[PDB]
Amino acid sequence: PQITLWKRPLVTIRIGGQLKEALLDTGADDTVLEEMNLPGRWKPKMIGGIGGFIKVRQYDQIPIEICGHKAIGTVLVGPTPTNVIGRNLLTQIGCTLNF
Amino acid sequence: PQITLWKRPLVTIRIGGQLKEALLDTGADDTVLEEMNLPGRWKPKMIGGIGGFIKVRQYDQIPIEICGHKAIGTVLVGPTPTNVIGRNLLTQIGCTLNF
Numbered sequence A, B: 001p002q003i004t005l006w007k008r009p010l011v012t013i014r015i016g017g018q019l020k021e022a023l024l025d026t027g028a029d030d031t032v033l034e035e036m037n038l039p040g041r042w043k044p045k046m047i048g049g050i051g052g053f054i055k056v057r058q059y060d061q062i063p064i065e066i067c068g069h070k071a072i073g074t075v076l077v078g079p080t081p082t083n084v085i086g087r088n089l090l091t092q093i094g095c096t097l098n099f
């Protein structure tokens, strides 16, 4: 799709059979989801955003379907204000910025 | 142009007499720039992201040039780790997401 920016670029994602809304976030290097359960091993990690640093759980090789497009990659889970899809997965789905 | 997301979408902006590098950030509602002593009135605001909130000064109707494109609108100034061009100005320069 082509998505304009007069509204937040929120899209439905499917992850682990669950449907969630997430924000396409070109200013995020990483994909960060709000607290949820995911299977398998994870590693503790820390990440910084505008307001400082948080702890997250880093899960590798997770499938997410983003607006029907398939990705498999790293997903960080922790106290983000909102689910964000970052460039690690935006690149997988062929997302670009155009003007 | 088209900007892929293999690396951060950093572009050149001008505000005035200051040229700075800023992210084209679809996850940012409003543009937030690092500390600068702009002329005119402003209002205090607090904005939130990963890690919590920061305090910023909201300046309105500021002309910025982004990759040679004209924009004018709100600019929040405060101690952000990274300059971001948010949706308020991205729309003005014709920026969409495409996949």
Ligand SMILES: CC(C)CN(C[C@@H](O)[C@H](Cc1ccccc1)NC(=O)O[C@H]1CO[C@H]2OCC[C@H]21)S(=O)(=O)c1ccc(N)cc1
Binding pocket: A023, A025, A026, A027, A028, A029, A030, A031, A032, A047, A048, A049, A050, A051, A081, A082, A084, A086, B025, B027, B028, B029, B030, B031, B032, B047, B048, B049, B050, B081, B082, B084, B086
């Ligand atoms: C978390 C989002 C809903 C909102 N943010 C925009 C977001 O693009 C920031 C923009 C950003 C970028 C760098 C540093 C601070 C903030 N990125 C970010 O937090 O990314 C984190 C996840 O991947 C990592 O890569 C970058 C930092 C990590 S935000 O910076 O907090 C923000 C909030 C309000 C406005 N008006 C402007 C910006």
